[PDB]
């Protein structure tokens, strides 16, 4: 006989994930400001990471956390992001207090838990942008023309965040965001 694995194994995740930090430093390039923190592939290792790092609401203005599948960089130019897009959550200055950290943790748990049913493989990662003008959280998916997957991911995410039907969230392709005239980008989808 051997030991019962239930008693001592860490609980593996479907994917290895990488947490990244973007430091707002205008004296350096974007590339120099984006660094890996670390990677993990079990539930226990996720919590060891999350438990020791600052909440998003305590980061300096202009900084980001990103959690992406191992081997996908948190930039739209990556092979797995270039044809993709994001479900965008915009927060006002009051939601910094009431919602930012709860929403970001919920987002992490959606990712690591593979919460998108048959469409989990379309998910690349998520980003939280801590900004004076208003915070943002987004789930990034790999193909903006996978209508079924994108719509499914949106509904799941909306309901996991606990947003009421009244609240509307939008999906924007990275290409559209990159080429947008003016402040607002058109939504390919809404839920």
């Amino acid at each position: 006989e051997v030991a019962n694995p239930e008693h001592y194994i860490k609980h593996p995740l479907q994917n290895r994930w990488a947490l990244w930090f973007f430091k707002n430093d205008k004296s350096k390039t974007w590339q120099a400001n984006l660094r890996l923190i670390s990677k993990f592939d079990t539930v226990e290792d996720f919590w060891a990471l999350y438990n020791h790092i600052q909440l998003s609401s305590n980061l300096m203005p202009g900084c980001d956390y990103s959690l992406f599948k191992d081997g996908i960089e948190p930039m739209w130019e990556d092979e797995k992001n270039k044809r993709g897009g994001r479900w965008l959550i915009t927060l006002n200055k009051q939601q910094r207090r009431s919602d930012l950290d709860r929403f970001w943790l919920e987002t992490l748990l959606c990712l690591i838990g593979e919460s998108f049913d048959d469409y989990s493989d379309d998910v690349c990662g998520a980003v939280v942008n801590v900004r004076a003008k208003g915070d943002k959280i987004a789930i990034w998916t790999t193909e903006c023309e996978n209508r079924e997957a994108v719509t499914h991911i949106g509904r799941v995410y909306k309901e996991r965040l606990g947003l009421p039907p009244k609240i509307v969230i939008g999906y924007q392709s990275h290409a559209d965001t990159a080429t947008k005239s003016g402040s607002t980008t058109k939504n390919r989808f809404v839920v």
């Binding site: 479907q14 838990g113 593979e114």
Partner: peptide, 14 residues
């Protein structure tokens, strides 16, 4: 495939 509910993830923090 490995799927965890939200509940399960929180429980494994303890």
């Amino acid at each position: 495939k490995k799927r965890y509910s939200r509940l399960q993830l929180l429980l494994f923090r303890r």
